[PDB]
Structures are given as structure tokens and as C-alpha cells.
Design a protein around this ligand. Structure first.
Ligand code: NI
Length: 157
């Protein structure tokens, strides 16, 4: 069948940014519920099991703008006291509610640390090589959770 709203799709992919390969592997996801970046879902939309294609997903359909207001000054004491805080250092934090919050230190002045809160792929165009491996309809549980499941293990989130 074809990829579309509420299918669980399995893909094999290679993700390349600026001619360099960043990730590759296989995943299943529930289509039509924001589980992938919108532009990759858009390229998958309507495709049949078996297709292999290249998709250039522009920044505005991937991780969005590198927003200048995401670059802010925060105090040194905000970091663990044994952390190496120097220009260019990367940190991987978790934002109040729990989400990823990768960050980059761009400047350090006494107790003042200039931090970039933007996602690392902000403003990057992404190139995928994709194979559509499997398309199936979702179970009621998968529809209820908003995502794909591997097997028959009843659970909650
Ligand atoms: Ni679940």
C-alpha cells in the first residue's frame, strides 16, 4: 500500500548534510502525527512500498531558522561547577518540560556566558536517500499513543 495518514511506515535511510553523512539506519514511524520533520513526511507521502528516492528537505521544512534571539547571555553558575565552559563547547540539556535542549557556548566573559539555544541543524538543508521498506495500517493502540510500536506489549505513556 501507499504511505499516508495513519500508516506505520518502515524506512531505511541515509541522512547527509552539506555532503557529509550524519546518520543512517532503519526506523518505523506513524505517519501524519508529526513524528518526523514535515518535509521528510511530505516526500514520503503517497509513495508505494518498494520506492527508493532522494529527498532534498530545505531548512524551512526541517529544523527551521537559526533564530538570532536564541542566542542569550546566562550566568556561569547555571552550568555544573566542574563543566568545561569555553567558546565552542556543546552541551545537551533537557528543557524544563523534558525535551532535548542542545546548546552551544559561543562566548565567555567572567560570569557571563553567551549560549546558542538553537538546534544544531537549524538553517541546514537535509539530503536523504530513502527506501520504503514496509507500509501497513496502524493498530488502535498505535493510533491512541500517536506513534509506532514494535510488538504486542500493552503499556501507557
Ligand atoms: Ni507506546
Amino acid at each position: 500500500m501507499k504511505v499516508g495518514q495513519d500508516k506505520v511506515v518502515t524506512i531505511r535511510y541515509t541522512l547527509q548534510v552539506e555532503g557529509e553523512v550524519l546518520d543512517q539506519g532503519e526506523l518505523s514511524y506513524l505517519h501524519g502525527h508529526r513524528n518526523l520533520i514535515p518535509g521528510l513526511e511530505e516526500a514520503l507521502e503517497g509513495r508505494e512500498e518498494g520506492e527508493a528516492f532522494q529527498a532534498h528537505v530545505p531548512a524551512e521544512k526541517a529544523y527551521g531558522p537559526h533564530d538570532p534571539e536564541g542566542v542569550q547571555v546566562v550566568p556561569l553558575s547555571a552550568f555544573p561547577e566542574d563543566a568545561e565552559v569555553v567558546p565552542g563547547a556543546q552541551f545537551y540539556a533537557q528543557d524544563m518540560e523534558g525535551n532535548p535542549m542542545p546548546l552551544t557556548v559561543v562566548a565567555v566573559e567572567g560570569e557571563e556566558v553567551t549560549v546558542d539555544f538553537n538546534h544544531p541543524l537549524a538553517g541546514k538543508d537535509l539530503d536523504f536517500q530513502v527506501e520504503v521498506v514496509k507500509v501497513r495500517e496502524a493498530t488502535p493502540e498505535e493510533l491512541l499513543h500517536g506513534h509506532a510500536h514494535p510488538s504486542g506489549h500493552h503499556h501507557h505513556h
